[PDB]
Design a protein around this ligand. Structure first.
Ligand SMILES: [Mg+2]
Ligand SMILES: [Mg+2]
Ligand SMILES: [Mg+2]
Ligand SMILES: [Mg+2]
Ligand SMILES: [Mg+2]
Ligand SMILES: [Mg+2]
Ligand SMILES: [Mg+2]
Ligand SMILES: [Mg+2]
Ligand SMILES: [Mg+2]
Ligand SMILES: [Mg+2]
Ligand SMILES: [Mg+2]
Ligand SMILES: [Mg+2]
Ligand SMILES: [Mg+2]
Ligand SMILES: [Mg+2]
Ligand SMILES: [Mg+2]
Ligand SMILES: [Mg+2]
Ligand SMILES: [Mg+2]
Ligand SMILES: [Mg+2]
Ligand SMILES: [Mg+2]
Ligand SMILES: [Mg+2]
Ligand SMILES: [Mg+2]
Ligand SMILES: [Mg+2]
Ligand SMILES: [Mg+2]
Ligand SMILES: [Mg+2]
Ligand SMILES: [Mg+2]
Ligand SMILES: [Mg+2]
Ligand SMILES: [Mg+2]
Ligand SMILES: [Mg+2]
Ligand SMILES: [Mg+2]
Ligand SMILES: [Mg+2]
Ligand SMILES: [Mg+2]
Ligand SMILES: [Mg+2]
Ligand SMILES: [Mg+2]
Ligand SMILES: [Mg+2]
Ligand SMILES: [Mg+2]
Ligand SMILES: [Mg+2]
Ligand SMILES: [Mg+2]
Ligand SMILES: [Mg+2]
Ligand SMILES: [Mg+2]
Ligand SMILES: [Mg+2]
Ligand SMILES: [Zn+2]
Lengths: 86, 135, 59, 134, 52, 158, 50, 122
RNA sequence: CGACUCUUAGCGGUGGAUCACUCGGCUCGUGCGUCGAUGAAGAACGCAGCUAGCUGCGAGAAUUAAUGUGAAUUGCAGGACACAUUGAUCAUCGACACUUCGAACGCACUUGCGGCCCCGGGUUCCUCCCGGGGCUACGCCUGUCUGAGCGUCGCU
RNA sequence: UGGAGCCGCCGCAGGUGCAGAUCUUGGUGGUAGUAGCAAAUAUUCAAACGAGAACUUUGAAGGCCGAAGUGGAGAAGGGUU
RNA sequence: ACCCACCCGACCCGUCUUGAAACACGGACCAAGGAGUCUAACACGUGCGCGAGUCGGGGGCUCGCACGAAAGCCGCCGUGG
RNA sequence: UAAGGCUAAAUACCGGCACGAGACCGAUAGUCAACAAGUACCGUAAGGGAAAGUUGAAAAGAACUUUGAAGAGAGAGUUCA
RNA sequence: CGCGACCUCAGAUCAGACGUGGCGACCCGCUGAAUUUAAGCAUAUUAGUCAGCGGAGGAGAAGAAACUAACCAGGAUUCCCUCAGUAACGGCGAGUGAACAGGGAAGAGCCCAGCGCCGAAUCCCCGCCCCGCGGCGGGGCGCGGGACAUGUGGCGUACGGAA
């Protein structure tokens, strides 16, 4: 019974989609994640899983603010001006 | 002092490390005091603390804090060093007068550990195979 | 129609009235398994649906 | 040699630079020589080839002394299609065969204002260098 | 590893001795010809020239 | 296990040392960087010696070194007082001053006064404006040299 | 399930949109290495981010 | 056919809106036509109309925001939008006048004991 | 000779070694050394005429403006444009814009309930009703207003 | 055969020579057209479509589930089935 | 060197073992991969340079390094070992 | 001269942006990853984690005829092949 | 049983500011093993090392002697070479292990409290004008508010300082 017949009654779920990290690891009863620790103000990362660390470092995502900051800096953080017009 | 936070005793290990009761934190209580004042008032920038009394159970302290962004501090040149962002969280890094003392740095023979920047840095220097080009 | 998913029936009603100068009896939305909120919109009986249908292009 | 310590001379780097080149940069890469006739007249070695120049193919199969008008410039494919440079496919349909711009010679340019100002800029730099050498 | 002993350091007189040895055999047409250099029609082997 | 004769020798490779190996592939790149930075600093301090300020003569400590003599950190206050240079000014003319130096013997003092005197002789103080007031030297000793001094200024030779 | 949240329903919708096979005009593009979608998910075998 | 930024710049505010509306209408009909086949000739426009719509909306926001920062250029407290965003930290630097405030003691020092240009060996 | 089996060779299969290529790595070096409540990183969901994935962008959504460039983009369509004109296409990027979660902020995570000010229909301030807009996290500093106390006084 | 690079000599350098490691990754045999495609009684006739019918569909017959159902509806789970 | 014949000889390799054709283990077959490395310290041997000396580091002076992150030089030539 | 404080520089830098180089590897190597890779896929979850480069100079990628329901062929053609 | 000072405390969607999370190669503060070695093992070692928590910057930390020395004396910090596998520690076993001097890279020094003098001579915020405004500043003018004598600012800090 311990095996195949008991796989039969896996009718209901522990985790769902976490709304910070996106992973299917938000434990419903605990009402925390276990991936980012969602309710926890700070993100969960541990130094033992260097592979896990790399899977959602900065680079990873869009970097939609951060990628235009790098450009902005390059040319010198100029604000509120234009190039000489035609 | 500081009892070792482990369930029951059960500091599983070699019986050097079996101690839980008679052992003592590195930083002072006064530093802990500052650190807590610092924690609470994040904007505020811990300058320095002093003592105001002691019961058996408690100590008391008085941590002088400073707004780094109040014009009267900003514009006064002699203070405006605290408004620089290297001085964020002095107390947390071991930089107030109190939390300096634990670091174990002073000039002369009675130190040597901390003969670079700090305790950690000297060890670092002393345990680097410098491996030169030509040897 | 297909409608923007954020819309209330109240908004749809108001839009349908505004765009097509028309007037509505009732709006009756659902969400397609696809993502696009569909909307069935009953026009008031002074108006014919096939007539407006010809006006807007569809038939 | 190259002495400038910010250029590359690194197969992988040059090829990557080449194949992943952006349109406006490809324009320059896809340049082609002028005929000795024009070389005399404008004081210019070569020019970025364009939609409707007149042109000879110099090398290959289509190598010939005919002067075909350019048909289009496929900067993605690093190639230009030329009037009668074509081949019949299985089912009779003609297909414009690609020729690389550099294996072609421009006999007649399509002169617009901008092409005119380009030629004026290149000729001037050439004569500055001859004055500096002298 | 990176800290393989890449560089190799030589006594200074020895370095000089080598450089004297090479100079001394930059004379000697045989040693120059044997090293491949077509020096058949050259006028004098320690070949020295005007300083224009 | 040891086998027949040899130094019963203790290597210190029991910690994780390969985690803290420090290579020297920098060093050429470093040596240049210093050298550029050096040449830049010269060029900034235009006719001033590249060296730095002038520094005192000083004997080493201990029985061992004792006999030798180096450059010290800076001239003492007595030495400035006797030479007749106001300590706050001495910094402004390129004279190193430490103030923590005692001065035990009068042989080391008069030597170090002599140094400063000699310095003041062979120094070319430019005037503040191109219009020339007191102290500032003649335009002769100015045109003939706005020259830097290569190497340590008035070097000590034991 | 027939009792869905909206969160879940939207998730399913996108998954349902992703399944379609490549458009054949893609094969005729210039630098094309793609022959088939290879991210096609059949409900009976392989069972969602859920 | 072409709507340029060029011309829109000068136009009146009410005039810009009517133009946007008239494009929004034109976009609708093409979207309708995309459903009912329509024609490739129509299904071009849909991209064109979209970008011309953006060209209009863009001009409007540029005009509204230029006028706005004219209105505050002078006033001390101004909206966060119109304040200059550089980088979180960079908006907490010392003020540009505040970081070259010498203490009177330090000023006096610079007056009495200025570093002098000097050379040696003559 | 017969079939079968074994051996060798020819040719054909199977299989993908070898060799030759390399828009990828690995290492060493140089310069700079910049994220965030003005909403970061990260996640979500969207957006193409035909587009699933990768990329690119945000309801102005394979991008707007500007400047530089100067005829393309191109799988097919369609188109534009007068490429003697702010002008295709790329590049740059200073103006504009930037859906929803997220430190994450009205309170909740259903995507549910709200409050308070103003605007349009709704009224003719009649509050309702609908739609739009702007506020409504915690901590803390400098001030401000309202206060509390058989806390310490003064005058009445 | 193949279709774009490669070798001799003198020196230097090394991630330098395989039959084995119940070695690692990939491939291929003999075993073998073998074991096997046996739980729960059952199929038959004609026609239609169709290149093609033991298996589809329609009709006819013979059978079973036998309302604690092999019937009629949900929950959870699936996610377009 | 391909095949066949015949006479004589001739057990299967690897390995641990006093002893393996073993009724000792590993091994169906083929391809590619696959294990005494590097650093440090010592000692002895050998080769070279200089020799009561020797030394080169570390640092510095000579270049934007194409070759150079080399090469050269240093009252630092010897602080020091 | 302790029990208050500030301070550039030589120093560090397997993260970032942007470059340069190599007695390195050359698709079972080199990063897990030369490719729609932290992808597919697995696991409730923490986490685990692949395989996979190469037609040709040019698509000129085989019109047309014929056998077959078709896949498949036979001729024809393209290509220096 | 009022009104008014102050003190200590509240509440504001009060006016204006800041802090929150990220990254983490390098850096600062804590915390802190056990494989392992010792041919066993418990002290020792592995190691103030991995994991854990905290906080930063373009670097950080350190730093202007309550220092070294014992000399004919040196003279902040950091870095390299050396000292030195040395002095020392250690079931004096395994093993561990610095500093000064010396030579270099660099080089830069300063400020308070206090003690005192100076009509608080000081600071913040309001409001009106002129310039300047994409790092909110200058100048002027307001019986316009507040902070402050339970001490702000100038002079001054051991190298002496004041009058
Ligand atoms: Mg122990
Ligand atoms: Mg103490
Ligand atoms: Mg120096
Ligand atoms: Mg299933
Ligand atoms: Mg003062
Ligand atoms: Mg055969
Ligand atoms: Mg393969
Ligand atoms: Mg070839
Ligand atoms: Mg190798
Ligand atoms: Mg093998
Ligand atoms: Mg059978
Ligand atoms: Mg049913
Ligand atoms: Mg044995
Ligand atoms: Mg035996
Ligand atoms: Mg055997
Ligand atoms: Mg037997
Ligand atoms: Mg065995
Ligand atoms: Mg076996
Ligand atoms: Mg092999
Ligand atoms: Mg020897
Ligand atoms: Mg400090
Ligand atoms: Mg491969
Ligand atoms: Mg391969
Ligand atoms: Mg690989
Ligand atoms: Mg291969
Ligand atoms: Mg192949
Ligand atoms: Mg291959
Ligand atoms: Mg061939
Ligand atoms: Mg933080
Ligand atoms: Mg042991
Ligand atoms: Mg053992
Ligand atoms: Mg044991
Ligand atoms: Mg220890
Ligand atoms: Mg750690
Ligand atoms: Mg610092
Ligand atoms: Mg001190
Ligand atoms: Mg010292
Ligand atoms: Mg020794
Ligand atoms: Mg230790
Ligand atoms: Mg005072
Ligand atoms: Zn999460």
């Amino acid at each position: 019974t311990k095996g195949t017949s008991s796989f039969g009654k896996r009718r209901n779920k522990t985790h769902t989609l976490c709304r910070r990290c996106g992973s299917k690891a938000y434990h419903l009863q605990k009402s925390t994640c276990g991936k980012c620790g969602y309710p926890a103000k700070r993100k969960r990362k541990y130094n033992w899983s260097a592979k896990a660390k790399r899977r959602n470092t900065t680079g990873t995502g869009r970097m939609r603010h951060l990628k235009i900051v790098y450009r902005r800096f390059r040319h010198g953080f100029r604000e509120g001006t234009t190039p000489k017009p035609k | 002092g500081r009892k070792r936070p482990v369930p029951k005793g059960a500091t599983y290990g070699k019986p050097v490390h079996h101690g839980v009761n008679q052992l003592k934190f590195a930083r002072s209580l006064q530093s802990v005091a500052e650190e807590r004042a610092g924690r609470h008032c994040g904007a505020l920038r811990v300058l320095n603390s002093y003592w105001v009394g002691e019961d058996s159970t408690y100590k008391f302290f008085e941590v002088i804090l400073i707004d780094p962004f109040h014009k009267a501090i900003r514009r006064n040149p002699d203070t405006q060093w605290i408004t620089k962002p290297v001085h964020k969280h002095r107390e947390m890094r071991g930089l107030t007068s109190a939390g300096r003392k634990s670091r174990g740095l002073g000039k002369g023979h009675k130190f040597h550990h901390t003969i670079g920047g700090s305790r950690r840095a000297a060890w670092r220097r002393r345990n680097t195979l410098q491996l030169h080009r030509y040897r | 129609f297909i409608v923007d998913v954020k819309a209330n029936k109240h908004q749809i009603k108001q839009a349908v009235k505004k765009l097509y100068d028309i007037d509505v009896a009732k709006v009756n939305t659902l969400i397609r398994p696809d993502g696009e909120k569909k909307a069935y919109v009953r026009l008031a009986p002074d108006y014919d649906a096939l007539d407006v249908a010809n006006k807007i292009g569809i038939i | 040699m190259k002495f400038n310590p910010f250029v590359t001379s690194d197969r992988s780097k040059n090829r990557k630079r080449h194949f992943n080149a952006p349109s406006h940069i490809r324009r320059k890469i896809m340049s082609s020589p002028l005929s000795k006739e024009l070389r005399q007249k404008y004081n210019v070695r070569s020019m970025p080839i364009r939609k409707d120049d007149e042109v000879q193919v110099v090398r290959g199969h289509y190598k010939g002394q005919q002067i075909g008008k350019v048909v289009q410039v496929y900067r993605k494919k690093y190639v230009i299609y030329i009037e009668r440079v074509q081949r019949e496919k299985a089912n009779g349909t003609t297909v414009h065969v690609g020729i690389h711009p550099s294996k072609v010679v421009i006999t007649r340019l399509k002169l617009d204002k901008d092409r005119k100002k380009i030629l004026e800029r290149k000729a001037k730099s050439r004569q500055v260098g001859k004055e500096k050498g002298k | 590893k990176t800290w393989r002993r890449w560089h190799r350091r030589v006594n200074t007189t020895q370095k000089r001795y080598a450089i004297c040895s090479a100079l001394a055999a930059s004379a000697l047409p045989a040693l120059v010809m044997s090293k491949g250099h077509r020096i058949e029609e050259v006028p004098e082997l320690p070949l020295v020239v005007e300083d224009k | 296990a040891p086998s027949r004769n040899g130094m019963i020798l203790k290597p210190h490779f029991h910690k994780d040392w390969q985690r803290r190996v420090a290579t020297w592939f920098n060093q050429p790149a470093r040596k240049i960087r210093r050298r550029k930075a050096r040449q830049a600093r010269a060029r900034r301090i235009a006719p001033r010696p590249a060296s730095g300020p002038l520094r005192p003569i000083v004997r080493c400590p201990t029985v061992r070194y004792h006999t030798k003599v180096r450059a010290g950190r800076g001239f003492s206050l007595e030495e400035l007082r006797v030479a007749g240079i106001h300590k706050k000014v001495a910094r402004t003319i390129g004279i190193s001053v430490d103030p923590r130096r005692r001065n035990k013997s009068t042989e080391s003092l008069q030597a170090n006064v002599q140094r400063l005197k000699e310095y003041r002789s062979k120094l070319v103080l430019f005037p503040r404006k191109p219009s020339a007031p007191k102290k500032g030297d003649s335009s002769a000793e100015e045109l003939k040299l706005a020259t830097q001094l290569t190497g340590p200024v008035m070097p000590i030779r034991n | 399930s027939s009792h869905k949240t909206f969160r879940i329903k939207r998730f399913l919708a996108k998954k349902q949109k992703q399944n379609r096979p490549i458009p054949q005009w893609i094969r005729m593009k210039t630098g094309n290495k793609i022959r088939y979608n290879s991210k096609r998910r059949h409900w009976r075998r392989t069972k969602l981010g859920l | 056919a072409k709507i340029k930024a060029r011309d829109l710049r000068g136009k009146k505010k009410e005039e810009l809106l009517k133009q946007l509306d008239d494009l929004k209408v034109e976009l609708s009909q093409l979207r309708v036509a995309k459903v009912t086949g329509g024609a490739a000739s129509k299904l071009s426009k849909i991209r064109v109309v979209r970008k011309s719509i953006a060209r209009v909306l863009t001009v409007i926001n540029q005009t509204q925001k230029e006028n706005l920062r004219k209105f505050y250029k002078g006033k001390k407290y101004k909206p966060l939008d119109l304040r200059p965003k550089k980088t979180r930290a960079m908006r907490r630097r010392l003020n540009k006048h505040e970081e070259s405030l010498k203490t009177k003691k330090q000023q006096r020092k610079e007056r009495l004991y200025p570093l002098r240009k000097y050379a040696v060996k003559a």
